[PDB]
Amino acid sequence: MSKIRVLCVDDSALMRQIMTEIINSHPDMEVVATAPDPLVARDLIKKFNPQVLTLDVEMPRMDGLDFLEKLMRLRPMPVVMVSSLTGKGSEITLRALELGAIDFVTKPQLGIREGMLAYSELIAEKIRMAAKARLPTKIIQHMPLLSSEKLIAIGASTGGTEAIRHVLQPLPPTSPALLITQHMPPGFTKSFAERLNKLCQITVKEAEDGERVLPGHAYIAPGARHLELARSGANYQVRLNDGPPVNRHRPSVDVLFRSVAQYAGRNAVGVILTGMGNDGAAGMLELHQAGAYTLAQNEASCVVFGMPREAIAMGGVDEVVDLHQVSQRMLAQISAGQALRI
Ligand code: NA
Ligand code: NA
């Protein structure tokens, strides 16, 4: 088929040429135009009709988030953000994801050759995804507080920051603990957790090694460690694992799902959400085999139907569900395994 038409917006002249070199070197994509700011990009989008836009967050003289707001409103298209591994970049990137950008990449040190080739392969991966991606609050009432043995595990990748936000926002304070692994670099996961916390009735935080796993709390995996459930005596604990990535994933959804299958078993509900790849598929099968009920986000609501698809294909998914029914289905399911207290 034809090459993917990419438009790159970046304030740095060197980056605009770097992106040109990277993207054009791949045979299934090409840079049809570059632009240093949102104004020049506007007319180039109309002239060259790109399929994918890469957008650097830090543009000095203007405001790129309002460009992204207007773009997603009047001409929505796949947008991949390019961010710096900084706190200011993390806040702007998450806000970009709220406005409708589907994914983002962090710039490594491109002065080192291996950082340039890793960035190159990552940029090509996001562009191929973005060309096919689908582009995208009542509090649930009368939820009883269940046993602290009850737990929900959630995994996500591309589109997962918005999917997770839609699932957590209506959760009442009596919701069981949630362990959440979202593919994300270190640092970003802290700002991610902090923004979700301000939007949620439950407490959302980045998971800390050794802390007890409490009802009404969601624990976000840190960007540089595997998040696992562990059992310290009688009580659930967070365990952060600095072991190696598994198929280039740390935190890994598979690792989380397996640890939950092991230490929670039938007292858990597993949820696999939008994202590319197969992370979570094999762990969800262990969860299923341990007696946990498992849900997978359906294709019509996924930005990328990759991770739920692979989980389904592995045979460990009980139920496919639209994103906007996930909150109710997972609460109802985990509640059904809870005997009366009264
Ligand atoms: Na090319
Ligand atoms: Na909160």
Author numbering: 1 to 136, 145 to 350
Sentences from the paper on this structure:
The pathway sensitivity is adjusted by the coordinated action of the CheR methyltransferase and the CheB methylesterase that catalyze methylation and demethylation, respectively, of several glutamate residues at the chemoreceptor-signaling domain. CheB is composed of a phosphoryl group-accepting receiver domain (REC) and a methylesterase domain, and it was shown that REC domain phosphorylation stimulates the catalytic activity of CheB.
To address this issue, we crystallized CheB_Pec and solved its three-dimensional structure at a resolution of 2.3 Å. The enzyme is composed of an N-terminal REC domain and a C-terminal methylesterase domain that are connected by a linker of approximately 25 amino acids. In each CheB_Pec chain, there was a gap due to a lacking electron density that, depending on the chain, extended from amino acids 137 to 144–150. Lacking electron density is generally attributed to the corresponding protein segment being disordered. The gap was flanked by a segment with high B-factor values, indicative of significant protein flexibility in this region. However, microcalorimetric titrations conducted with all nine pentapeptides and at different analysis temperatures did not show any sign of binding. The answer to this question may be related to studies that have identified the pentapeptide-binding site at E. coli CheB. This binding site was found to comprise amino acids 130 to 140 (colored in red in Figure 7A,B) and is located on the C-terminal extension of the REC domain and N-terminal part of the linker. The inspection of the sequence alignment of CheB from E. coli and P. atrosepticum SCRI1043 revealed a high degree of sequence divergence in the pentapeptide-binding area. Importantly, a large part of the E. coli CheB pentapeptide-binding site overlaps with the gap observed in the CheB_Pec structure (shaded in grey in Figure 7B).
